[PDB]
Design brief:
GO molecular function, one term (chain B): metal ion binding
Protein name (chain B): Short-chain dehydrogenase/reductase SDR
Strand order of the largest sheet of chain A: 10-17-16-15-14-11-12-13
Organism (chain B): Chloroflexus aurantiacus (strain ATCC 29366 / DSM 635 / J-10-fl)
Largest sheet of chain A: 8 strands, parallel
Structural class of chain A: alpha/beta
Family (chain B): Belongs to the short-chain dehydrogenases/reductases (SDR) family.
Keywords (chain B): Metal-binding, Nucleotide-binding, Oxidoreductase
Helix content of chain A: 40-55%
Oligomer: homodimer
Chain lengths: 542, 537
């Protein structure tokens, strides 16, 4: 009768390799699975196929045609599913998008900009890989009884150096953060959330996609694959009984799925299981900023630093103050036209009790023209852009909850804080690397810091999701910038040095001196000769 | 037929709630279980009850009577187990003896020093809770076919503040690190190693031991209990359908065990599963020393520092140089009788412009010579105020943790693990045995530099020292605040950190790490992170 007998499982990404095996195996374990997808012919072909493979009654298989990106299509779809079945016992977030396969500078943002091998926009990649699971957890959760299971399917590569794969890998890093936070709020309901990290799984498709990554790098046959096989601790037998490092099967993923769906995992919430044959990859890239800053870096003379901000004007004031004492010129770009307004008002406060405030220009990720516009002005007036500090689009988080939240806010957090932050970086990377092919005599070196908002009573839940995205972006933006550097140097092209980046998290501090402390290191890190290795730099309570 | 059908499982720690429920459950999934233990009456008693409990044939159960601490006893026992059954499919490392329950100053080291409520030596607690699983993993491995599973059962509290529980919690944290490292070497044999972290599991027993922990900490009923329940993210239903935060059951733990013993987890190695109702605990408490030191802390005038080391003569010199410029006096106590030799040899080379400190034997094997060091310090240097503790040996004993002989592994346990807790406990007892105003004692444990091994023995050692520090701070805070209310004028509480330099192998990094050691011992502030990392620079 099977281990999931009588339970109702919803599986997204039913078409994909992994989604198909999860369906066949849950059917064999006695579940009624509903597969959800975008094309009505595709699901019906799959469901007939998955019925035939399982050897199961007809009413035990079902489908719902949905656009998992649209939360109102999700409300429609869930209501239909409930009305036939009453409740959902397992929710499996599979999400088969693979992302555009391009470097950070070359990522597509609009359909016109779309090309071969890059079939979705960035925002579509974010809405598929991070939005979809988020919307289900919010809408299905009121129909899941005490004892239910959410399963989120991530990848191992969301924490690994994965060349050219930012639109895929970054919303995955964000989803992990989403899972842990959803475990808190759904755990208080008796609903458990847990996560699977498949390694490289066996496919005909994955064979070609390691090749495209190999071609994007310099490197020959087998390169990306042999490297990850070598992080594997566990060898396995072949038919002759010899040991070997190979990829896991799709059935391995489904074993971990069944366990996490059945009542044999009833006491677990917030756990992760890496189906990788024990690929060993470093987990923590953090450190505390514990030392005093020492602004003896008047080396910032001539260099000019961009501040991407908006609505956080206390941070902008200190940031320009620090950077000016270093000798750096500052350009400041407010992301919403509103933020310019009360900033001009703040300088009006400055004119009382009075000396010059900096230049403010529009800098909007929705309208990537104004980013390119800012670069052009900087070349004519301030002699370039040499460093950037990037802030959250908003000062405060939209809501205290990750599950119990309206539809509009969640769509805004996706467009503003996640896609919009990637956009700024992708224009930065192309800027510095379209110029690196220019210089003749000798050049300085570019640096980036992402500086978060201060501690919040929410526990900074939305900020922490954003932080997980910024982290994995840096991991890959360092890696690409380095390989593009050494490669373009093989061309003999005297190129600007590769971009370095860090982020400073302020979540454990909410003091006025805490702000000045964090802004001074921002100025120190943008223009120092040395660098810090850790990706995330934490400022303590002090 | 069941999920472990035909599989041969050796289960240590067969008695007690978790070990028993694992035996009955493996029997229900069709395995033949061998339970391993110390008393033949207890094992034969265990086999009959669980034979009756499982409702399973007799030849399905078996026992081996052995001293799991003795590797020569293990060779005898495993070879015999193989002789009855041919092979081993599952190894479950349970152990779980609770250790002697005393504060670091009062922990027993010799049978005479044993007392009521403290029934094991320190070394015995280490030989049970860390060695046994280690020796099984080494000796059983040549009898485990490709596809086998090792399950190491730790506790969630191996990362927790547990007043009076150092002999328990410190070898568990060590065993964790040991598991990860062996996954590399056993993975190359086709063998899985994976780890279960039970939370506080429900018993009538744990009710009472939370009551005793409440009493030692001075805090009232439920204080220790509510503290762990409130970290739990996952609620569960009661019989009437209402939600509540309660502890997991014993069967919840055995569900995860069956998963990790069965071929449904065939692609897993180096994983951990926390059966905790989603207890939320901070994972990383580490930080990098990124700044340059600044020795304007002549606050060390009059204060005197003990250096515990041996065979690391370059650090011993760099340390005395650092500490003297701060104004501290230095005593050096070498851990091996060898270490005196080449130090006395090096100083003869220099003088044949350098004035060496007094160098004395200081051996945790013989805790008498520790009291000797304190005695000289009282007559001569006006006391001991700060300590630096270094590994008993500079170079790692072996490149492997599994393919390694018995003597080396036994020496590593005696010196680097039991011997390092020994030093800490006499330090804590010294400082706490003691009208106007007082200064404050400080400790830093300094690791060896980077190794071609990746420092596997160093990482096992460091993992224990980390949890050692957590509880040594915790006890010191409560021991202080309590004893001073009695009106006894005692020193302020001990603080400690460790400096791990495994990611650096340059001489300037060596000087950098020695400099931070001196600064941290005599500075007024303190660093909260327990583990302090020096980068490559």
């Amino acid at each position: 009768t099977g281990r999931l007998a009588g339970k109702i499982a919803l599986i997204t990404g039913g078409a994909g390799n992994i989604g198909s095996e999860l369906t066949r195996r849950f059917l064999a374990e006695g579940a009624t699975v509903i597969i959800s997808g975008r094309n009505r012919a595709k699901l019906t072909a799959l469901a007939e196929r998955m019925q035939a493979e399982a050897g199961v009654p007809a009413k035990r298989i079902d489908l719902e045609v949905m656009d998992g990106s649209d939360p109102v299509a999700v409300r429609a779809g869930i209501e239909a599913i409930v009305a036939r079945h009453g409740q959902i016992d397992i929710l499996v977030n599979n999400a088969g998008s693979a992302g555009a396969q391009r470097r950070l500078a070359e990522i597509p943002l609009t359909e016109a900009e779309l090309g071969p091998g890059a079939e979705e926009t960035l925002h579509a990649s974010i809405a598929n890989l991070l939005g979809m699971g988020w919307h289900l957890m919010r809408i299905a959760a009121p129909h899941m009884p005490v004892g239910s299971a959410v399963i989120n399917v991530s990848t191992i590569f969301s924490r690994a150096e994965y060349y050219g794969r930012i639109p895929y890998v970054t919303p995955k890093a964000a989803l992990n953060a989403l899972s842990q936070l959803a475990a808190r709020e759904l755990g208080a309901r008796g609903i458990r959330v847990n996560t699977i990290f498949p390694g490289p799984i066996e496919s005909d498709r994955i064979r070609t996609v390691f090749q495209r990554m190999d071609q994007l790098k310099g490197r020959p046959e087998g390169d990306t694959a042999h490297h990850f096989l070598n992080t594997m601790r566990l060898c396995r037998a072949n038919d002759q009984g010899a040991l070997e490092r190979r990829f896991p099967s799709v059935g391995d993923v489904a074993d971990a799925a069944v366990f996490l769906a059945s009542a044999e995992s009833a006491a677990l919430s917030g756990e992760t299981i890496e189906v990788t044959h024990g690929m060993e990859l470093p987990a923590c890239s953090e450190t505390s900023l514990l030392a005093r800053t020492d602004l003896r870096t008047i080396d910032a003379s001539g260099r000019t630093t961009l501040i991407c901000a908006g609505d956080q004007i206390e941070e902008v004031m200190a940031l320009t103050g620090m950077l000016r004492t270093c000798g750096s010129e500052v350009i400041i770009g407010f992301r919403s036209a509103a933020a310019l307004a009360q900033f001009e008002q703040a300088v009006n406060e400055s004119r009382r009790l009075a000396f010059t405030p900096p230049i403010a220009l529009p800098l909007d990720p929705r309208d990537p023209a104004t980013i390119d516009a800012v670069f052009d002005w900087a070349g004519e007036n301030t002699g370039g852009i040499h460093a950037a500090v990037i802030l959250p689009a908003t000062s405060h988080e939209p809501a205290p909850c990750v599950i119990e939240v309206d539809d509009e806010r969640v769509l805004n957090f996706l467009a503003d804080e996640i896609t919009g932050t990637i956009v700024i970086a992708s224009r930065l990377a192309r800027y510095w690397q379209s110029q690196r092919l220019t210089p003749g005599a000798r050049a300085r070196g570019p640096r980036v810091i992402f500086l978060s908002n201060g501690a919040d009573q929410n526990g900074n839940v939305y900020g922490r999701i954003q932080s997980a995205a910024i982290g994995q972006l840096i991991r890959v933006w360092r890696h690409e910038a380095e390989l593009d550097y050494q490669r373009a140097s093989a061309a003999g092209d005297h190129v600007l040095p590769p971009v370095w980046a860090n982020q400073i998290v302020r979540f454990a501090n909410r003091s006025l001196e805490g702000l000045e402390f964090a802004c001074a290191w921002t100025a120190q890190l943008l223009h120092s000769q040395r660098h810090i290795n850790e990706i995330t730099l934490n400022i303590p309570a002090n």
